[PDB]
Write a sequence for this structure.
């Protein structure tokens, strides 16, 4: 069949393009009849690796997100709400898969790694990425793999909250691109799953609570974490980590009518915007992200207390009549 | 052993009290390896039957709640978030269980039934309750059962919304008490479960959206439904159907500072309350119900548009700093 | 072109009387089984109203409990084949 | 406890047109084959009202004829599977239906209906997609007449399987007019619509037979009892109090469409009634 | 008195968008399989217009190629059993 030319048995072919074909990953639960507790193995997708001539990591996004715990609503788009009737998690297999949309003529580097410290900070440069134990180094166009070192320790989910994210999380996951020529798309990576659900509980809420200090930095958290809400002395920051349709509820301290800006992949849905000028205010809004960078920001003055809540929601109303 | 007196073999003993002992129902998932889709059988509790000298049904609560679909967040406290990665539901066994906290000297009637029309309205009186096909009639102190007629039709969950709640719901569930002497507690009923999960999907959000028309009645819904938000010309109504810690977000049209009342089982958590007097307003609040009747109401004037959202949440903040 | 029916219909609430009483101490063989008896059968009310002959296959009296293990009395269900004989005078009849 | 019915219920008297009429040259899928249809099934009405799932086995349209071999017209019975599609426009449309019959008026006709065995729901709670619950639609259509007189009386061959029983529905009808308004509650079935016009009521029949009417209303102004079409008044009693409101009980007996009645009055500021099919039964003092 | 049909109908021309898009980024579950869907089915347009029930036996999506081995993207066909659920927000859904 195939006739390929200029080839004598034992020779190399670098083709114009390559592609694998990906299908319906329909999960299987297994009954580990135990404490009458469950086990799940399904395939959840994870992000579209775009290029970075320069040197970027999960989107140039920072605050080890990525985090291998399930939920990571940030990471795992389906497991979201099962390990949600449960309290202890434990994997058996997790494998990074890297397919490629681009073609044998893009010019760059992608790279998947694994840090056992859910908390150490991120890759600085070339020489650092490469020193990791569990790493892989691929041109972008060519097809790649990574399998992850799983213990069987009895590890806890984030339902109550826990600052030592390391003693509870399994690992960190990296994806890193340098040496590109443009920050376009070349890769879409997947997630090979297998998890052991344990002491199943009243089901935890997935709702987000995020306080800015009055002049300050940061008050409480509950998370998960889709959002960070910073202030700058005038003006807020609502910096997305998550994608989809959300629902936003809250307001803040200002005095000064709200001007609703945002930036990147964004589909505003319902912006409602009470103020009282002199005092504080409220915002409900409903938006829908499908990118990074998605940003939004409220524009205001004298941002002297920041409060919000975020808890994923449909094309759902959020405005008066 | 037992010596009971005044008894010749063949005689009857009506004891001072009776009780069964209930344990940890730890669910089993079964793998029906299918379209790689799952099956669940666990035991979810359902409500505490209190008495009604007069003639009451699920709490004197109205708008067939109760509804056998899973989710019914109103009914099923655990199944809440699994049939949540899925789109078709189908039971195999559902059995009403009625144990009793009270004692052989309370003086009343309890009664479990089953309407195949998720939508027909509720029991009027004595003669009506009794005419149902699948009913049971117990004093209260004595121990009772009911098993439910399950088809195997391919029925849909409420993720998109659907006014003919009958063509999608399996059944209605009733619990009815007449002839008491006081509206105290005698019974706590359970739910024998067995469900076949099918075409598993991107996981639906559980968030509630509830619009009051300007002068009107009712705008949209998304539900589930934990809440009904009515107005009266001055003043709102937030009428609970659900129990737990919620999170409330919204505001409304008035002009007139907010006075936060509510009634029954209620643990207010965070009430924040922007207004602008003249115009509309906003409320975020965080409360926590464990009863019916839980009520809350906002007190205001010229309630000319009602909007809210409700999506179960923890002891989570909902106020500035 | 005939029907058959099997359902369960409620009937009346038995109250107490230390005396000796019979159907509420109402009199004139009310409880007669015929269907209709609107007094007795609240539901079949409207099937045997489209019909002219009737014939039962099962009839069972069912007696549940509103009171409590310290109520202090006697209840009693019977059956007379004569829709017309009078009622029970006393205990011994 | 699953009952099976096979009976023969009467249905309507077909009048002619020159023009092109359907189910009365009336509208809003009247006839829907579900039992209840208080409008269609005058007998099955209050049997399946103790039940929740319906399913037929046989339904046959029968067309006998009162007229004579010299009328000049068309009768025509058909069957739409969509309880909801709208009605026959013209000649060419009626004829294209799968289950139709095309007869003169004087000559004798039949139609049998395609029954599935799907588990279909009755109308106790309400359901806007009347199609996913209803078995079929039924048509009767007449064109090419010379006068809108009567030629035909059609019947209903029944066979139905009743299932889960709990509470007879309401064989009894409750129908509120708002004070100045339109419409308050309903319970139905629905044999009647009770409208007001600023002076005067409307009691517009959908049903045929002997009824019993109970109620009165807000006016002030003695009652003059008119009605129109097939109608056999039975007992009209008529309390008033002039200045205030009033009451009417009456007992009438319809066998047509159009049956109308109307009460004539002034300042119709609240309408209330109840209607629940009844015999040649009294409804007046002595 | 019923029909059966097996033919092949064209559907729309998939263009590209580096963004993330769904049916043309038109919205309101257009592609619904019901026949008619005049938007989707250009041919059956006029058979299921003489009919009231429908039922499929086979449905297969077929995707051929206008572009060339250096086009640079992703296409993707799916199927929701809920004619009504909303559309895909992102990659992960
Ligand atoms: Ca935990
Ligand atoms: Ca759905
Ligand atoms: Ca019913
Ligand atoms: Ca006797
Ligand atoms: Ca019903
Ligand atoms: Ca779907």
């Amino acid at each position: 069949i195939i006739t390929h030319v200029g080839g004598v048995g034992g020779s190399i072919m670098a083709p114009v393009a390559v592609s694998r074909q990906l299908v319906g990953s329909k999960p299987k639960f297994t009954g580990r009849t135990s404490g009458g507790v469950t086990v799940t193995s399904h395939r959840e997708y994870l992000t579209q690796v775009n290029n970075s001539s320069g040197f970027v990591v999960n989107g140039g996004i920072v605050g080890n997100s990525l985090q291998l715990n399930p939920s990571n609503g940030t990471l795992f788009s389906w497991l979201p709400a099962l390990a949600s009737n449960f309290d202890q998690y434990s994997f058996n297999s997790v494998v990074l898969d890297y397919v490629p949309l681009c073609g044998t003529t893009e010019v760059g580097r992608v790279a998947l790694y694994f840090d056992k410290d859910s908390q150490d900070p991120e890759p600085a440069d070339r020489v650092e990425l490469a020193n990791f134990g569990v790493l892989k180094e691929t041109a972008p166009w060519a097809e790649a793999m990574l399998r992850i070192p799983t213990d069987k320790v009895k590890r806890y989910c984030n339902d109550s909250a826990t600052v030592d994210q390391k003693l509870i999380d399994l690992g960190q996951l990296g994806i890193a691109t340098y040496g590109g020529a443009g920050a376009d798309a070349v890769g879409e990576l997947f997630l090979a799953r297998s998890v052991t659900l344990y002491f199943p509980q009243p089901t935890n809420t997935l709702l987000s609570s995020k306080r800015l200090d009055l002049t300050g930095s940061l008050a409480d958290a509950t998370g998960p974490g889709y959002l960070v809400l910073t202030r700058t002395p005038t003006v807020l920051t609502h910096t997305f980590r998550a994608t989809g349709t959300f629902n936003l509820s809250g307001g803040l301290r200002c005095l000064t009518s709200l001007t609703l800006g945002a930036t990147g992949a964004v589909v505003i849905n319902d912006i409602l915007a009470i103020d009282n000028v002199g005092t504080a205010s409220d915002y409900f809004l409903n938006c829908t992200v499908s990118s990074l960078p998605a940003t939004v920001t409220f524009t205001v003055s004298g941002v002297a207390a920041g409060i919000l809540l975020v808890g994923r929601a449909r094309a759902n109303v959020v405005n008066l009549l």
About this structure: Residues 222 and 240 of chain D are 6 Å apart (CA to CA). Residues C 80, 82, 85 surround calcium ion (ligand 4) (CB under 6 Å). The two ends of chain D are 45 Å apart (CA to CA).
